[PDB]
Design a protein around this ligand. Structure first.
Ligand SMILES: Nc1ncnc2c1ncn2[C@@H]1O[C@H](COP(=O)(O)OP(=O)(O)NP(=O)(O)O)[C@@H](O)[C@H]1O
Ligand SMILES: Nc1ncnc2c1ncn2[C@@H]1O[C@H](COP(=O)(O)OP(=O)(O)NP(=O)(O)O)[C@@H](O)[C@H]1O
Ligand SMILES: [Mg+2]
Ligand SMILES: [Mg+2]
Lengths: 379, 390
């Protein structure tokens, strides 16, 4: 019979180990790599806040991942739930300091689930925290804490998370260096002044330094390095509104491909959302309202043909975000659709006028790319 | 910053704080997700073979009635010392889908579904028929208002009535057509299942006879014995048929079942619909990727054998061109990207779907050379059309 005894309540991390796909999105390489993002995105939130200026990540030999920061560190002192804050953050879901714009103003994190999930789907988790004028060591064996130990009193501040992914959870436990390198480089572009270092101590040692003072501009310079830029200038505009900011940097390449990267609080919203679509709505209307004003191909230009051969970065800095899942693939802030739309619309028009040479080259590009579609459609 | 700067959200409080995590967005999708998490549950009872009918009413006031003739949400006092209805409704990771006992194949697996609805609903009323009684329990701003044992009954089932909190959603008007298409697929995926949809807001389902005629309410009845085959007909109802014989094949194994129905149209758009335990895995997944790669490989070695190519390269993205296909898996232990269950991640399912498609597709292509050659030729023209772009 189906009744009272059939229904069961899972105790937090039990839910993560049972259904990892809800928090990690998959048990495959994508989900494996997601444990690094939870830990690094957390460290980078401290740099978004400004308390950290350096984040070092290590792909350890054994299988571990070491992520350090010169931030404030994970609160150590006794939490209101009894157990010290470190343990709360590491073992309990919806236990975070990103539920308000107090501790962290603009942050990638928001659910209070990230590093707790890492702790769940990890065999071991070690944390080093230099805070409250002292160093701290706490070890998590199979998610369970071994006890909080206090070390040497240091003036320096920050946290160092280390984690060994559970192979019983994950098919592959070996990370991809280029996947890590790529993502960390983006976080460096999206956070001017920040330095990310990645070393691969796997069996000489592979290491990268990621510091881009040119921010989003160097990001496009990077995307259009291999593939010839059609124009010299790089559109670089930044709008700021009520609990949301937006920096947009873009340039068109001589290729026939879309290279439009979208971010929200550094976090890679690679399914876009209401910041991508807000940028898309403005870019389609601006280029069309410029093409119509200048010079013709009677139907309207598609966004997909306007964006064909475009390297574009859309980075939004929102106070109260609305992310798709723990994965954070899509942005849902309805308000941010119209916020990016307006900033994008006024500033895009302002670039077109100011740069008539580049404008002519990119609109002719949108026309020739559109004419090619109708031409192919005829077959 | 410190210990005081850390808060712990108590289940439903977290859903209300971060709705997107669970429902995706507080826009159309998320509002519609609410109805899905409630209907998904009824379909689970239908999949378990207890419920034969799901009724979903979109009420004038904005609420949603969801009635089923399943077993009914457990009413008896739970181990936690509270009615099991209460647990199911007010607690996350609380459910009967963690093991395969109560439900063999079910969309639900996280135990978050119907509790999220309650969290994002200003009112959720519940009527359960089980244990020889009609049980009622009202949830006002998530909080239960008392379980009532009413009229005796031999009849069984659940009736969930929620009211999405306008404080959460950008808009609260549900789109009937969004609802009709989603409930429709559920009836294609489940052969013996009948889903009734009725919109109490809309009134449409000589002129003198039309006035005197009783006042109808907008209604649809979804029952499809033709299953996936009648689903492939539905997709190609507005697309010209290139081959008559609809592809229909099954595949049962270790901890999964796979049903494929596919037919090619004159179109240039890929209409490949994938489902894991009736859930719309519209962001693809292992089953789709397993099918894609098997379909690429089958078509290629057929074209190589028949000398229909043998000479360049036949990508899957040009084989699926103008393909109406439905990939429905019944996985005992499913994997999903988040509460929205957008992508099916079961690695073993990929290889399983690959081999089932590999053997049965070849079997179909060999059995029907009249239909087979016309498909390969459509992939031939729609390959030159690809290279035309270059
Ligand atoms: N490296 C760190 N330095 C300082 N504070 C940290 C660090 N890592 C985690 N925290 C704190 O611990 C909390 C919990 O982390 P986490 O579990 O990732 O949830 P979250 O960051 O609030 N949101 P989310 O990332 O969406 O799950 C955070 O809110 C931070 O306040
Ligand atoms: N209409 C119903 N009839 C009988 N039992 C139900 C019904 N709806 C929900 N339940 C029970 O309540 C439990 C919890 O529901 P729910 O919150 O939607 O999570 P879930 O069904 O386990 N799955 P999920 O959608 O992944 O969160 C289910 O597992 C069922 O056992
Ligand atoms: Mg985080
Ligand atoms: Mg469910």
């Amino acid at each position: 019979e189906y009744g009272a005894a059939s229904i069961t309540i899972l105790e937090g991390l039990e839910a993560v180990r049972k259904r990892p796909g809800m928090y990690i999105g998959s048990t495959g390489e994508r989900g494996l790599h997601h444990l690094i993002w939870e830990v690094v995105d957390n460290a980078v939130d401290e740099a978004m806040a400004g308390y950290a200026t350096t984040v070092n990540v290590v792909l350890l030999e054994d299988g571990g991942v070491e992520v350090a920061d010169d931030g404030r560190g994970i609160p150590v002192a006794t939490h209101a739930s009894g157990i010290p804050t470190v343990d709360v953050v590491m073992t309990q879901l919806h236990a975070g300091g990103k539920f308000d714009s107090d501790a962290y103003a603009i942050s990638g994190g928001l659910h209070g689930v990230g590093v707790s999930v890492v702790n769940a789907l990890s065999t071991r988790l070690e944390v080093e925290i230099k805070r409250d004028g002292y160093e701290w060591s706490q070890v998590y064996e199979k998610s369970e804490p071994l006890g909080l130990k206090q070390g040497a009193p240091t003036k320096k501040t920050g946290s160092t998370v280390r984690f060994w992914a559970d192979p019983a959870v994950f098919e592959t436990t070996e990370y991809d260096f280029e996947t890590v390198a790529r993502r960390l480089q983006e976080m460096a572009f999206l956070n001017k002044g920040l330095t990310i270092n990645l070393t691969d101590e796997r069996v000489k040692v592979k290491s990268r330094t990621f510091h881009y003072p040119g921010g989003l501009v160097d990001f496009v310079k990077h995307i259009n390095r291999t593939k010839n830029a059609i124009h010299s200038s790089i559109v670089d505009f930044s709008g700021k509104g009520t609990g949301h900011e937006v920096e947009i940097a873009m340039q068109w390449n001589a290729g026939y491909s879309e290279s439009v990267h979208t971010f929200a609080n550094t976090i890679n919203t690679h399914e876009g959302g209401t910041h991508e679509e807000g940028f898309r709505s403005a870019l389609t209307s601006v280029v069309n309202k410029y093409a119509k004003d200048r010079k013709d191909k009677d139907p309207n230009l598609t966004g997909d043909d306007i964006r064909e051969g475009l390297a574009a970065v859309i980075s939004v800095k929102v106070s109260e975000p609305q992310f798709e899942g723990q994965t954070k693939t899509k942005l849902g802030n309805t308000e941010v659709k119209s916020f990016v739309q307006k900033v994008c619309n006024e500033q895009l028009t302002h670039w077109f006028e100011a740069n008539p040479t580049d404008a002519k080259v990119v609109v002719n590009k949108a026309v020739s790319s559109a004419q090619a579609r109708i031409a192919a459609r005829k077959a």
